Design a protein around this ligand. Structure first.
Ligand SMILES: CCS(=O)(=O)Nc1cc(-c2cc(NC3CCNCC3)c(=O)n(C)c2)cc2c1ccn2C(C)(c1ccccn1)c1ccccn1
Length: 111
């Protein structure tokens, strides 16, 4: 049986995948497709790639000890996007909208 916090994490993630936020979430649904996009330097600048599908597998497979480890992976996904891409890029604008959704739910998660 998993903590009440880890259960709320599953609902936060689900909200991130909801149609409501799809217009900015969709680039984060799966691993960055480095071959298709032609990003030869990605795995050299980003040592720990992360996306919402990897986080969902890790969550459900009970690989997070707690909500804080779940949040560190969501934030690593955003950090990677902010590290790799120019500050004024649209994909960064999209990351920032999805991050706002996440930050707001993560903070309102009961103790
Ligand atoms: C679900 C994961 S995926 O399968 O890997 N899909 C996609 C992922 C991403 C993506 C790209 C990043 N960086 C690149 C670096 C090079 N310059 C462009 C941005 C990034 O950091 N993340 C997190 C996601 C862009 C995608 C698609 C599909 C289309 N596009 C882009 C490039 C695109 C291609 C063609 C037409 C329109 N848009 C795009 C660019 C900007 C915003 C959204 N998509």
């Amino acid at each position: 049986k998993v903590s009440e916090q880890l259960k709320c994490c599953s609902g936060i993630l689900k909200e991130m995948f909801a149609k409501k936020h799809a217009a900015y979430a969709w680039p984060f649904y799966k691993p960055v497709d480095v071959e298709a996009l032609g990003l030869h330097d990605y795995c050299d600048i980003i040592k720990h790639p992360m996306d919402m599908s990897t986080i969902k597998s890790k969550l459900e497979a009970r690989e997070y000890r707690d909500a804080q480890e779940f949040g560190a992976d969501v934030r690593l996904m955003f950090s990677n996007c902010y590290k790799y891409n120019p500050p004024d890029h649209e994909v960064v604008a999209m990351a920032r909208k999805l991050q706002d959704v996440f930050e707001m739910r993560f903070a309102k998660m009961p103790d």
